[PDB]
Every structure is written in structure tokens, then in C-alpha cells.
């Protein structure tokens, strides 16, 4: 079967997982308490899709997920919330303090004594799996528990499951908006884990999603619920190829084969085109060409970077709903003529295309309108280097005076390791600047 | 406020018997004042290059060209520093490095007394000069103390009582000092060696995954030197008072290296904190010495984190004002210890990092 | 569970602790007899942070009370919430310190410290996962200084890795109550600098100014000042007891706010404050709370932040609000007042949000600043100290208790060093050789 395991680390991961599992349960017709009346009414089909759920003899469906965090305060909301009966009781809470925005704490002084249990639960989930394809690790840069425990967990998973894919859906610090003082240290220290052990790291920015919510959706005071719902929509669009039928399906291995030219540049941007309110859902055709053009607009990107300041090297478009390949080919032909959208000379093919028949689903109480057609773009571009460089500057401004360093070295961290991470990160920037140069 | 220049020295030891028997490889190269290290895991990427004041290739014992003999190391560091101490100004030498590296060789040297460390050679020169210059008017006095710092608590090694935590006070005129610390007079370098051996017997050590008796505490040997001149005058007074400190810094420690919880983790955290504070204070001192020496403009009073650790606090008089500093870092040459050596090199990068190349 | 042990010493500390326990019991809906009569299930979700459970479905606060004068205990027992506390935790002597730091530290407090530490050990052993301590005292110079610092040192020695928080009332230049405030304040600030992780500076002058100008009270009393300090204390640790969109543990605040070990003196603040006359004329939104929080007159430390620079800031909001507004307001505050913020930190405003506001408010906010202006407070004390130490104004009362003279000098030196630290980052440029 086609089966993927989701892992949520930290508060950001837990809340994004709440949104994601709300979306999946709405998609597959599973009630919050795990039952599905559809199978009893029909007596056929395969709506208990193995991509995310496991069936028991009583008709109850258990999600293939593991929630991890050192704070008990965010998981206990789930354990006493609406979905308390959906998940297995093994929610893996560490009954201690948080990593407290310290990478060292989350990594190797309190992240231990729970990593063994987490790996045991992951092994238990994988043993029930027959055709396990990859992992979907949700976390967030900048935080302590997220960065540190993700580093430890990905290292152990690469040791144990070195062949399987490992996708990341992480949140990157914004240029100006941030909710922590020591955030750049954790974000820079996360470079080793997001480089060596990750196979394809998707990054999003809070400022960009706030701008999208303000402009497109006309929500002037959005909260984290809207951000989590948008990220859930993108993840569902990525993963839909393994569940529903389609004219052209795209597996995870196909993503990894088409999007990354070289091993070290697996950091693509992601975006979602038909983000529009119900009021503005009218007055708009929302054809294939319009959404395909809306993908390339610099204002709709979910990371505060300018694609116009770089060169595209690999694009992948996943269409959902009433989409025919003729319109997609016409849209690609229209795109290739525009001069603002510059492609590297060494990738003349350009685009990967996938189409799926299942349209998007509207979450009740949400903000996205019902749309017959939708598309999700993944794009490998050099402009992401800009989104790194600014953060790099911030790190220097705090490392010149060794500010906040004593907290990290008080938990089994060598000071020089900071520099080591910085050095590695610098190489990444140069590597990106190496690939965008025109051939000779 | 005269400033204190700091000299950074690195030295490489030969292969031990176990490493010599095994097919180990050298990873360290030296050219003038530049030292480069090559990763064995991916040798094809690049060697990381660093710059220090002195780089010492003591790798091959019978080598004829560019061998940093112990007498050479003395002549660069200990001779000049002893001469500075003779003028009446404070002195402090530091030793850093991981276990299995040098340290003991650099400071003490071999027991056969054919090749000696900085400590016994410095003591011999001190006492020979004392016997040479002691006329009817001169009077030279030497005293020694030896203490340890462990979780920011001071303990005495010479005195065999119950090892309580001694109290640290601040004389308004004489600066920081330790209350109820044993101080003894000495008449030869043999007495110095005896007291140092007795103190080293009493230091705090513990068993970890890196060594069975890894050091768990810093230790300092203060040599107090006093000069009295009975000149042809009606008022004879102690002309000058100077101190010489020899510091044995315990090496850095990582969490994964020592998985034990409780005491060992707290010891490692305290050692790491003291080490970063010492790095900061030495780097600030190096920068402040460099600036005025060329500009000769005293910018207000600057600042320096004296009160961040007991080690930097008690060495406040020696570290800065008017003194000299120097640190020697020991390096293993075997690929097997590569990461460890790199960490040592990184700590040597502080103290007015040289850029060059 | 992240569980805290609360200690209080002296008249000021005990009264602030009584008001604080009243506020906390009201927040959790605890009957003064100890029973529970709350409205929601979240109140008992995290009751173990401050309370232990008895077999009769009663909740006993995890508080320990200390005073060498028994009278302060009696007024606490003969009060609205007197019966709530455990009788065994009323540790006290029968001889006052007499505003002598030496008596509270060396002569009298040294005998009661053993019993106090035994009670603290008993309380801590019952805690399944202790987080830190919370001491309420004052630097007037009686029990709160001497016994406070002695207990701080002893607890730090016993429990090195736990958090140590203290809410301390400083002396003031314009309002004074004892003649020997500077000596005791300096001697206590020495130990506070040595052995604490967070110290929230409180000034009677600032609280009186808040009462007169912001709350428009005509006859303020100590109850109102205790009420304000209690509101700040609850707001600091709100995130440990309730869920939120972005949590802030005590250790999170300690890590984000303290760049270097010695710079851990904080200026607290609270919003909203409307005086009950212009309440109906005020629109309550996140921008209004942000405007009131950063206002100079709202600070509780009696130090103008405009005379220095902010090393760090933390804002803990309570209530249902959108985080885009909060982040935009913090960014706007940083950009519009860029001169008053340190520049070698790219962003120095920690943010936290909680979904459970106070009982009778739609939304509120707690402020914790860390700025160079606090040095002014220390400088004032130092000046007064010199004015008494050059002539030995009242030293014979201290030296009679076995205190050496040199210790005073040591404390002064340490105090001066701290000022120099806070002076290092104050200048808004470094170019000139
Ligand atoms: C607008 C409204 O609903 O009425 C308010 C009110 O009018 C004002 C004037 C209240 C009022 O407060 C005061 O008059 C006051 C005077 C001196 C010192 C402190 C308070 C109020 O008394 C205070 C009281 O506050 C609370 O109930 C909070 O929960 C508060 N105190 C207590 O819960 C409490 C419990 C037991 C005994 C005494 C107080 C609190 C705040 C933070 C954390 C925990 C608790 C309320 C609702 C009001 C009145 C009644 C007028 C204010 O109170 C605070 C500090 O929140 C002062 O300005 C604020 C906000 C309001 O504008
Ligand atoms: N988009 C989005 N970002 C979030 C959300 N929750 C948290 N974040 C971001 O995640 C960062 C910190 O993540 P966490 O590691 O989970 O923080 P934590 O749960 O307190 O754990 P520690 O960082 O170790 O203290 C914050 O700076 C936020 O910007 C969310 O629900 N949506
Ligand atoms: N805020 C506040 N301060 C107080 C209160 N009672 C006393 N103080 C302050 O405490 C100082 C006197 O010290 P005190 O606490 O009596 O000494 P001790 O009790 O013997 O340790 C004075 O400067 C007062 O300003 C109170 O109820 N509230
Ligand atoms: N010329 C040299 N320079 C530095 N080290 C040397 C030299 N010759 C030999 N050594 C080695 O240095 C080692 C230092 O001993 P050791 O007790 O391991 O030091 P540490 O106290 O660092 O553990 C000895 O084992 C010795 O073999
Ligand atoms: Mg957390």
C-alpha cells in the first residue's frame, strides 16, 4: 500500500498537526471519534485510506501520527479536546520543563530520556506498515524543543531508516517579525539537521502568510489557525497523489527525482494559488491559466523572498479538480514566454506536471472558498539565499559579543560548535550562488 | 592600566605507542605561524587553517629541521615571562588541552630531567638568579600556594584537612584573595616539585567515557616573589612584590561524550562556563592591549568581565593592569581524536585572532 | 507538572504574599476554607503549580512564611485567608531584627534558618518536578534582607539547577521609613547579585505615582500597592497554569531576557489601568495595551527608561487576540523608538500569549523590562551609602553583631561593578578611538 508517517515536534508542529488531521478527517469522511458511517452505508470502497489511517476490527481508524513535545500544556489540549478519541493514547509527553528556546536542552540534556520511547513508537508504527514511503516531520526553526529534538530524531531515523524519504514542513524566522530573542542561534544551529538528514525541506514564513491573509482573504486580524489551515491545505495537495485517482499521479520519489538537481540544494519554496474569500470567489473565472499565473506572482510566495532576484531551476505543479492537460500545457507555454520568469539554461525541460481528480475540500468555519480547480506549486529557486542571508547577519550581530552564549554552553555545548554551524551555512549560500551561474 | 599582551602557542606531540602500533595518520600541518587541520572523514574537501603567535612541531623526536624543543619553548615564553616577573609585575601562564594530549609534558616535562617543562626550568632560573644577585644588601623571598576551583568553589590541596569550601574576599587595597589558604616558604625547586606532587595527589578527578581519571577541576600554583633592597639609606623597605601563576585548565566536555546524569553533567557545565568566561576575559585583554599600544589614547576605562567566574576573579590582579599573559595548547596528531583536537584549536582561535592569508 | 515553592519574609513580604494568595485563590476559585467552587474545568487543570491536595478535597497553598517578629504572623492568621495556610509553615522567632542586617543574617536568623530549610526541604520533596522558588521580601533591612539573602544562599547551595525568582522592594529617595536603608540595601543587593536568576525591582515611589496619576486614587494605602504587585506576580507565571497560542515558561523568560549572568534586574509593569472613572471612555485593544505598557509613568521601578537603553523586553498578553496585531505592535514600538533599544540585538521583545484573561477583563498584559536605566536606582543608594560610610554614622550597631567592617566595602565594590556593567551598553555609539 502507499503509507506515510507524520511526526509533529513542538507546539508549532502540534498545532499544524491539529489542522492537518482536521483536514484529513473532513476529506475521508471520518468522524472525530474515529468511525466512518460511509462504509456502513455503502459497504464498499476504500475510504479508509492507508496513506494516513489504520483500520481495526471494530471499524475504528487510528491515524499514523506521533505527537512529541516537552511541554504537557499543548498536547493536553488534544487529549481533552474534540479529537481526544481519534488518537492512540501514546501521545509521548515529557513530564518535565521545556527546552526553553535552548537548542542544547532540546538536543542532549533533556531531549534524552524521551527519544528512546519516540523511536520505539515509530518502530511500532512502521512494523504495521507494508509499503512505507516516507516521513512527514513537522517542526519549527527558532524554537528550542523543535530544533533540538528534530535534530536528534532525524539523526536517529537516518541511522535506522536511511533509505526512506524524510520531508520537512518547517517555519523559518521572518525578516523583522519574531517572538524570541535567541531565535537566530537556534535557526543557525538547525542547519546541520536540515542539511545532512533531510531529503526535501519545505520552508514557510509567518510574515508572508500574514500578508496573504490580509490581501487575498481580507482577514485583517488572522491568528495561527489560518496559517495552520493554509499549511494543511498545501500538505494535502502534496500528498493527494497517493490517495485519489488522477490522469497524471506524482509519487514522493517522483518529487525527489524531479525537483532537486544536486543533493545539497533540496530547499524548495511552496505556494497555493486559489487563496480567495467567499465574497471574492464570485467575479472571478479561476481558470487554469489564471491560477498558474498567480503562482508566479512574487506577492503570493509564502517566504519573504523575491523570485525576480533569482533563477528558477525546477518547478512542479500539482493540479486538483476539473483540470485537463491541454489547459496545463497552454499555461506552461504562456509562462515560458514571459521574461521576468527566468530559468537556468541547463534545465530546458523546466516543469513537472501532475493532475488529480479530487477537488479541494472546504473546512467548516474556515475562510477559503469552494473552488472547482486548485493548484499547488513547488519551486526550487536561488532567491531563497536572500531569506538566509538576512538571518545570517542577525547571528553575527549577537555572536560578536557572545550574547546569550552561557545558557547554551551550560548544557553540554562547545562554543566553537556555533562557528562550525555558521561555516556550514555559509557553504550553502555559495553552493546556491554556484548553480545559478550561466554555463560556459 | 598598562595593558597585558597575550601570546598564543600551539604544540603537537609525537604518536604514543598504541597509536604508533596502529596504522594511524597525521592530520596536522604547520608553516611558520599557520596551522592547518585536515578532516579524515572527508579528506578531499579542504583543511581548515588557523593562525596563532607560535606553532610548535614537536612531532618527530629525532628531527633536525624546525623542531620545537622544550628549551626553545622556554626561551620563547618562560624566559621572557620570568624576566618580566623580575621587574616587579604580575605573570600568569595557562595550560589547555584534552586528556591524552600534552599539558603535563608542556608544564612539567619528563622525569629524567634531560628535557623539562616550563615549571621546573622557570623555578631553576629563578633560584639561580636569586643566588647570583643576592649581595649583602639584597634579600629575596619566595612563597608558594596551590589551590583548585571546582564548581566555582575554592579548595586547598596542600593542607590535608576536611575539604571545605574556602571563602573569597576582596581586600580594598590588595584586590581579591582567598581566606585561610596555606602558604609555605621554599628553598629549592625540589621543594616546589614536592609540594606540587602532594597537591596533585589531592586534586579532584573522576571517571568518564573519555578517560578513567579525567580532571574535574581547575588548579593554580601561585608563586609570590618578594624583593627587599637594603640600600645606603635610613629607610629600608620591600621594593617590589610580584606574583607568578601557573594555571591547569581542564579540557572542554560535550554532553554526548559523557552521558551520565547528575554530578558529571553539572561538572561539565561548570567547566564549560568557566572556560568561556576565561576566553572572553583573555580576548578582551588582548584587544585592549593591542589598541593603546599603537593608538596611545586611553578610551575611558573600557570594561572586562572580572566577576563572571572565580577563576577570572581571583586572577584579576594578574590578568591585566600591568602584566603579561601566555597560553599553551596541546594537540594530538592522530586522526582518531580529530574532532577533539579541532575543539582545542577553536579555543586557541580566541585571544586576538590572527587573520592573515 | 512545573511546580513552584513560595517563600515570604518580613512585614512587606508577608503582606504581599497574603494579597498574592488572595488573588491566586480568586483566580482558581478556591474557597477561603480551602474547598473549590469554580466555574470551569481549566481551573483545576494546573492547580498543582501552587497548591497541594488534601484528603478532604481541600487545597493547601505551597507557601512558607518567615518572620523573627511573631506579630506579622498573627495579622495573617486573623485575616480573610488566614486559615488557608498550613499551620506548620508558620516558622517564626521571638526577637525582632530591629532593622539590623547583621542580626537577621548572622545572630538571630542563623538559628531559625535550620527550621525554615527543614520545612522547605519537606515541601520540595513532595513536589514531583520542582521548577523554581519565589521569594517575596524587601530591602528595608529587617528580616526580609538578612533572612531573605541567607535563605537564597542556602537554597541555591542545596538546589543549584532550579530557578530562583525574587520580588524585592527597593528603597526610594523621596519616601523613606528607616534611617539605615542604604547599608542594608547594599548588603542585600550583594547577595541578590550573587545568587539569583531573576529579580524584579519594585519601588514604593513608582507604585504611589501609579496610584495617584493613573488610578486617580485620593487616599492610597498599602493594600493597593500589594494588589498591583500581586497582579504582576500572577501575570508573570500565568503561562504555567493555562493553555495559550504561545507559551512562556519561567526558564524561557530567563533565557531570553538575561544576556549576561549579572544583568538580571527587571522593571515590571501591568496594563490596563483605567481608574474606574474613564473606564467607559477607553477602547480596549492590543494597541492600547502596548501604548500603556511602554509608557514611562507606568513603570514600577521609578527609573525612567528614556534615560538609558532597553537590553531586553518581554510582553505576556492574556486574552483572546490575534497574534498579527501583537507582532505588528511590537515591531512598530521597536521601529518608532529605535533610539531607546540596544542595537547589537536584532530583536529584543519576547512575546507570549495566553487564552485565559483575568476574571473581570477581556484582555490584559504584563511587562518585564531590562534596561540600563535601573543603574540610576543603584547609584542613588551608593551615594547615600558613601554619605554614611565616610563618617561611620551607624556602624557600631552592626559591628557589635560580629560583622567585620571590610564586608561593607566589598558590597559597595560589587554594587559599583554592577553599575559599570549597566553603563557599558548605555552609550548610543562606539566609533572614537
Ligand atoms: C472593567 C471591569 O471589569 O472592572 C474592573 C476595573 O474597573 C478596573 C478599574 C480595575 C479595578 O481595580 C482597582 O480598582 C485597583 C485599585 C488598586 C490596585 C489594583 C486595582 C477593580 O477593582 C479590579 C477588578 O479586577 C479583577 O477582578 C482582576 O481579576 C484582578 N483582581 C482580582 O481578580 C481580585 C481578586 C480578589 C480580590 C481583589 C482583586 C486581577 C488582575 C490580574 C491578575 C489577577 C487578578 C475589576 C474586574 C475591576 C474593579 C472591580 C473595579 C483595575 O484592576 C486591575 C489591577 O486589574 C485597575 O484598573 C484595572 C482595570 C480596570 O480598569
Ligand atoms: N505558523 C505558526 N507558527 C507557530 C505556531 N506555534 C508556534 N509557532 C512558531 O514557533 C516558534 C517556537 O516554536 P516551539 O519550538 O514549538 O516553541 P515551544 O513550544 O514553546 O518550545 P520551545 O521553543 O522549546 O520553548 C515561535 O517563535 C512561533 O513563531 C503556529 O501555530 N503556527
Ligand atoms: N509595598 C509595601 N511595602 C511595605 C509594606 N509594609 C512595609 N513596607 C516597606 O518595608 C520597609 C520596612 O521594612 P520591613 O519590612 O518593616 O522590615 P522587616 O519586616 O523587619 O524585614 C519600608 O521601607 C516600607 O516601604 C506594604 O504593605 N507594602
Ligand atoms: N616533545 C613532546 N611534546 C609534547 N608531548 C610529548 C613529547 N614527547 C612525548 N610527549 C607525550 O606527552 C604525553 C603527556 O602525558 P599525559 O599525562 O597524557 O598528559 P595529560 O596530562 O594531558 O594527559 C606523554 O604521554 C608523552 O608520551
Ligand atoms: Mg515548547
Care to describe what's here?
The complex is a heterotrimer of chains A (440), B (357) and C (433). Helices cover 42% and strands 15% of the residues of chain A. Chain A has 440 residues and is of the alpha/beta class. Chain A has 3 domains: 268 residues, Tubulin/FtsZ, GTPase domain (Rossmann fold), CATH 3.40.50; 115 residues, Tubulin/FtsZ, C-terminal domain (60s Ribosomal Protein L30, Chain: A, 2-Layer Sandwich), CATH 3.30.1330.20; 57 residues, Helix Hairpins, CATH 1.10.287.600. In chain A, strands 4-1-5-6-7 form a 5-stranded parallel beta sheet, sandwiched between helices. The relative contact order of chain A is 0.12. Chain B is of the alpha/beta class. Chain B has a single domain, classed as Kinesin (3-Layer(aba) Sandwich), CATH 3.40.850.10. Chain B contains 8 helices and 16 strands. In chain B, strands 1, 5, 6, 7, 8, 11, 14, 15 and 16 form a 9-stranded mixed beta sheet that branches. In chain B, strands 2-3-4 form a 3-stranded antiparallel beta sheet, with no helix packed on it. The longest helix of chain B has 33 residues. Chain B starts with 5 loop residues before the first strand and ends in a 9-residue tail after the last helix. In chain B, 39% of the residues are buried. With 433 residues, chain C is α/β, with parallel strands linked by helices. Chain C has 14 helices and 12 strands. In chain C, helix 11 links the parallel strand 10 and strand 11. At the A-B interface, helix 4, helix 16 and helix 17 of A face helix 6 and helix 8 of B. Chain C: It is found in: Cytoplasm, Cytoskeleton. Chain C: Keywords: Cytoplasm, Cytoskeleton, GTP-binding, Isopeptide bond, Magnesium, Metal-binding, Methylation, Microtubule, Nucleotide-binding, Ubl conjugation. Chain C: This is Tubulin beta chain.
Describe the secondary-structure layout.
The complex is a heterotrimer of chains A (440), B (357) and C (433).
Chain A: E1 3-9, H1 10-28, H2 37-42, E2 53-55, E3 61-63, E4 65-68, H3 72-79, H4 103-108, H5 115-127, E5 132-138, H6 144-160, E6 165-172, H7 183-189, H8 191-196, E7 200-205, H9 206-215, H10 224-239, H11 252-259, E8 269-272, H12 278-281, H13 288-296, E9 312-321, H14 325-337, E10 351-356, E11 373-381, H15 384-399, H16 405-409, H17 415-435
Parallel strand pairs in A: 1-4, 1-5, 5-6, 6-7, 9-10
Antiparallel strand pairs in A: 2-3, 8-11, 9-11
Chain B: E1 6-12, H1 17-21, E2 28-31, E3 34-38, E4 47-51, E5 54-57, H2 70-86, E6 90-96, H3 104-107, H4 118-133, E7 138-150, E8 153-156, E9 168-171, E10 175-178, E11 184-185, H5 189-201, E12 205-206, E13 214-215, E14 218-229, E15 237-248, H6 263-295, H7 310-314, E16 323-331, H8 338-348
Parallel strand pairs in B: 1-5, 1-16, 6-15, 6-16
Antiparallel strand pairs in B: 2-3, 3-4, 7-8, 7-11, 7-14, 9-10, 12-13, 14-15
Chain C: E1 3-9, H1 10-28, E2 51-53, E3 59-61, E4 63-67, H2 71-77, E5 90-92, H3 101-107, H4 109-125, E6 130-138, H5 143-158, E7 163-170, H6 181-194, E8 198-203, H7 204-214, H8 222-236, H9 250-257, E9 265-271, H10 286-293, E10 310-319, H11 323-336, E11 349-354, E12 363-371, H12 374-389, H13 396-399, H14 405-424
Parallel strand pairs in C: 1-4, 1-6, 4-5, 6-7, 7-8, 8-9, 10-11
Antiparallel strand pairs in C: 2-3, 9-12, 10-12
Helix pairs in contact in C: 1-8, 3-5, 4-5, 5-6, 6-12, 6-14, 12-14
Bound molecules: taxol, guanosine-5'-triphosphate (GTP), guanosine-5'-diphosphate, adenosine-5'-diphosphate and magnesium ion.
Residues 10-12, 15, 97, 138, 140, 142-144, 169, 177, 204, 222, 225-226 of chain C line the site of guanosine-5'-diphosphate (GDP).
Modified residues (N6,N6,N6-trimethyllysine) (chain A): 40
Main location (chain A): cytoplasm
Modified residues (Omega-N-methylarginine) (chain A): 339
Amino acid at each position: 500500500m502507499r503509507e506515510c508517517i507524520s511526526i509533529h515536534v513542538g507546539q508549532a508542529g502540534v498545532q499544524i498537526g491539529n489542522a492537518c488531521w482536521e483536514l484529513y478527517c473532513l476529506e475521508h469522511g471520518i468522524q472525530p471519534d474515529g468511525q466512518m458511517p460511509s462504509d456502513k452505508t455503502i459497504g464498499g470502497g476504500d475510504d479508509s485510506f492507508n496513506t494516513f489511517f489504520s483500520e481495526t476490527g471494530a471499524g475504528k481508524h487510528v491515524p499514523r501520527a506521533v505527537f512529541v513535545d516537552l511541554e504537557p500544556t499543548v498536547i493536553d489540549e488534544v487529549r481533552t479536546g474534540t479529537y481526544r478519541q481519534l488518537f492512540h493514547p501514546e501521545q509521548l509527553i515529557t513530564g518535565k520543563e521545556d527546552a526553553a528556546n535552548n537548542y542544547a536542552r532540546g538536543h542532549y540534556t533533556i531531549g534524552k530520556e524521551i527519544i528512546d520511547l519516540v523511536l520505539d513508537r515509530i518502530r511500532k508504527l512502521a512494523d504495521q506498515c507494508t509499503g512505507l514511503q516516507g516521513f512527514l516531520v513537522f517542526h519549527s526553526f527558532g524554537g528550542g524543543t523543535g530544533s533540538g529534538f528534530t535534530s536528534l530524531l532525524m539523526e536517529r531515523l537516518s541511522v535506522d531508516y536511511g533509505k526512506k524519504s524524510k520531508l520537512e514542513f518547517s517555519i523559518y524566522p521572518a525578516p523583522q517579525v519574531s517572538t524570541a530573542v535567541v531565535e537566530p542561534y537556534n535557526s543557525i544551529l538547525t542547519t546541520h539537521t536540515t542539511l545532512e538528514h533531510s531529503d526535501c525541506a519545505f520552508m514557510v514564513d509567518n510574515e508572508a502568510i500574514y500578508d496573504i491573509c490580509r490581501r487575498n482573504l481580507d482577514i485583517e486580524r488572522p491568528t495561527y489557525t489560518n496559517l495552520n489551515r493554509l499549511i494543511s491545505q498545501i500538505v494535502s495537495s502534496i500528498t493527494a497523489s497517493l490517495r485519489f485517482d488522477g490522469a497524471l499521479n506524482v509519487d514522493l520519489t517522483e518529487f525527489q527525482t524531479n525537483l532537486v538537481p544536486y543533493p545539497r540544494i533540496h530547499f524548495p519554496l511552496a505556494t497555493y494559488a486559489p487563496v480567495i474569500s467567499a465574497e471574492k470567489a464570485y467575479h472571478e473565472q479561476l481558470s487554469v491559466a489564471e491560477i498558474t499565473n498567480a503562482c508566479f506572482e512574487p506577492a503570493n510566495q509564502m517566504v519573504k523572498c523575491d523570485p525576480r532576484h533569482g533563477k528558477y531551476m525546477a518547478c512542479c505543479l500539482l493540479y486538483r479538480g476539473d483540470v485537463v492537460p491541454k489547459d496545463v500545457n497552454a499555461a506552461i507555454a504562456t509562462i515560458k514566454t514571459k521574461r521576468s520568469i527566468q530559468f537556468v539554461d541547463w534545465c530546458p525541460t523546466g516543469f513537472k506536471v501532475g493532475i488529480n481528480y479530487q477537488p479541494p475540500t472546504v473546512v467548516p468555519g474556515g475562510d477559503l472558498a469552494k473552488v472547482q480547480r486548485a493548484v499547488c506549486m513547488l519551486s526550487n529557486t536561488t532567491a531563497i539565499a536572500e531569506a538566509w542571508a538576512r538571518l545570517d547577519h542577525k547571528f553575527d550581530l549577537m555572536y560578536a559579543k557572545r550574547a546569550f552564549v552561557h545558557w547554551y554552553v551550560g548544557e553540554g555545548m562547545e562554543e566553537g560548535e556555533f562557528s562550525e554551524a555558521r561555516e556550514d551555512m555559509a557553504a550553502l549560500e555559495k553552493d546556491y550562488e554556484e548553480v545559478g551561474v550561466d554555463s560556459v | 592600566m598598562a595593558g597585558a599582551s597575550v601570546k598564543v602557542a600551539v604544540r603537537v606531540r609525537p604518536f604514543n605507542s598504541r597509536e604508533m602500533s596502529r596504522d594511524s595518520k597525521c592530520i596536522i600541518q604547520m608553516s611558520g605561524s599557520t596551522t592547518t587541520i585536515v578532516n579524515p572523514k572527508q579528506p578531499k574537501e579542504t583543511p581548515k587553517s588557523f593562525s596563532f603567535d607560535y606553532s610548535y612541531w614537536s612531532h618527530t623526536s629525532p628531527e633536525d629541521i624546525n623542531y620545537a624543543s622544550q628549551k626553545q619553548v622556554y626561551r620563547d615564553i618562560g624566559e621572557e615571562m620570568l624576566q618580566h616577573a623580575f621587574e616587579g609585575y604580575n605573570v600568569c601562564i595557562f595550560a589547555y588541552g584534552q586528556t591524552g594530549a600534552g599539558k603535563s609534558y608542556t608544564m612539567m616535562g619528563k622525569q629524567e630531567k634531560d628535557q623539562q617543562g616550563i615549571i621546573p626550568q622557570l623555578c631553576e632560573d629563578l633560584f639561580s638568579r636569586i643566588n647570583d644577585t643576592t649581595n649583602d644588601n639584597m634579600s629575596y623571598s619566595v612563597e608558594v600556594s596551590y589551590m583548585e576551583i571546582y564548581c566555582e568553589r575554592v579548595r586547598d590541596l596542600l593542607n590535608p584537612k576536611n575539604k571545605g569550601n574556602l571563602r573569597v574576599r576582596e581586600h580594598p587595597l590588595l584586590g581579591p584573595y582567598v581566606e585561610d589558604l596555606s602558604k609555605l616558604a621554599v628553598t629549592s625547586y625540589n621543594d616546589i616539585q614536592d609540594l606540587m606532587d602532594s597537591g596533585n595527589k589531592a586534586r579532584t578527578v573522576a571517571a568518564t567515557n573519555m578517560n578513567e581519571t579525567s580532571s574535574r577541576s581547575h588548579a593554580v600554583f601561585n608563586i609570590i616573589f618578594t624583593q627587599k633592597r637594603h640600600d645606603a639609606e635610613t629607610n629600608i623597605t620591600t621594593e617590589k612584590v610580584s606574583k607568578i601563576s601557573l594555571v591547569d585548565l581542564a579540557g572542554s566536555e560535550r554532553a554526548d561524550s559523557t552521558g551520565a546524569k547528575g554530578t558529571r553533567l553539572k561538572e561539565g557545565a561548570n567547566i564549560n562556563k568557566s572556560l568561556t568566561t576565561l576566553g572572553k576575559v583573555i580576548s578582551a585583554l588582548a584587544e585592549m592591549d593591542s589598541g593603546p599600544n599603537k593608538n596611545k589614547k586611553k578610551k575611558k576605562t573600557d570594561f572586562i568581565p572580572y566577576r563572571d567566574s572565580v577563576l577570572t576573579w581571583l586572577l584579576r590582579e594578574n590578568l591585566g593592569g600591568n602584566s603579561r599573559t601566555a597560553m599553551v595548547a596541546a594537540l594530538s596528531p592522530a586522526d582518531i581524536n580529530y574532532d577533539e583536537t579541532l575543539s582545542t584549536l577553536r579555543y586557541a582561535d580566541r585571544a586576538k585572532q590572527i587573520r592573515c592569508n | 507538572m512545573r511546580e513552584i515553592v513560595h517563600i515570604q519574609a518580613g512585614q512587606c513580604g508577608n503582606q504581599i504574599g497574603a494579597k498574592f494568595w488572595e488573588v491566586i485563590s480568586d483566580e482558581h476559585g478556591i474557597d477561603p476554607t480551602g474547598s473549590y467552587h469554580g466555574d470551569s474545568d481549566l481551573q483545576l487543570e494546573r492547580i498543582n503549580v501552587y497548591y497541594n491536595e488534601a484528603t478532604g478535597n481541600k487545597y493547601v497553598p505551597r507557601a512558607i512564611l518567615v518572620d523573627l517578629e511573631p506579630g506579622t504572623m498573627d495579622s495573617v492568621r486573623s485575616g480573610p485567608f488566614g486559615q488557608i495556610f498550613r499551620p506548620d509553615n508558620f516558622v517564626f522567632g521571638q526577637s525582632g531584627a530591629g532593622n539590623n542586617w547583621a542580626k537577621g543574617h548572622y545572630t538571630e536568623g542563623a538559628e531559625l534558618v535550620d527550621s525554615v530549610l527543614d520545612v522547605v526541604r519537606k515541601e520540595s520533596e513532595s513536589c514531583d518536578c520542582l521548577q523554581g522558588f519565589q521569594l517575596t521580601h524587601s530591602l528595608g533591612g529587617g528580616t526580609g534582607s538578612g533572612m531573605g539573602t541567607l535563605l537564597i544562599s542556602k537554597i541555591r547551595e542545596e538546589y543549584p539547577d532550579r530557578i530562583m525568582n525574587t520580588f524585592s522592594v527597593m528603597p526610594s529617595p523621596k519616601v523613606s521609613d528607616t534611617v539605615v536603608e542604604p547599608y542594608n540595601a547594599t548588603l542585600s543587593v550583594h547577595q541578590l547579585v550573587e545568587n539569583t536568576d531573576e529579580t524584579y525591582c519594585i519601588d514604593n515611589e513608582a507604585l504611589y505615582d501609579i496610584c495617584f496619576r493613573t488610578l486617580k486614587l485620593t487616599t492610597p494605602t498599602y493594600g493597593d500597592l500589594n494588589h498591583l504587585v500581586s497582579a504582576t506576580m500572577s501575570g508573570v507565571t500565568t503561562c504555567l497554569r493555562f493553555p495559550g497560542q504561545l507559551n512562556a515558561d519561567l526558564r524561557k523568560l530567563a533565557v531570553n531576557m538575561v544576556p549576561f549572568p549579572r544583568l538580571h534586574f527587571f522593571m515590571p509593569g501591568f496594563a490596563p489601568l483605567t481608574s474606574r472613572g474613564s473606564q467607559q471612555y477607553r477602547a480596549l485593544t492590543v494597541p492600547e495595551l502596548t501604548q500603556q505598557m511602554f509608557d514611562s509613568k507606568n513603570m514600577m521601578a521609578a527609573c525612567d527608561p528614556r534615560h538609558g537603553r532597553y537590553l531586553t523586553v518581554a510582553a505576556i498578553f492574556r486574552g483572546r487576540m490575534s497574534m498579527k496585531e501583537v507582532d505588528e505592535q511590537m515591531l512598530n514600538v521597536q521601529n518608532k523608538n529605535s533610539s531607546y533599544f540596544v542595537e547589537w540585538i536584532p530583536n529584543n521583545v519576547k512575546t507570549a500569549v495566553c487564552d485565559i484573561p483575568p476574571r473581570g477583563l477581556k484582555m490584559s498584559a504584563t511587562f518585564i523590562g531590562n534596561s540600563t536605566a535601573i543603574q540610576e536606582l543603584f547609584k542613588r543608594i551608593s551615594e547615600q551609602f558613601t554619605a554614611m560610610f565616610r563618617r561611620k554614622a551607624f556602624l557600631h550597631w552592626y559591628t557589635g553583631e560580629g560583622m567585620d567592617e571590610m564586608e561593607f566595602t566589598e558590597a559597595e565594590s560589587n554594587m559599583n561593578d554592577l553599575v559599570s556593567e549597566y553603563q557599558q551598553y548605555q552609550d548610543a555609539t562606539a566609533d572614537e578611538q
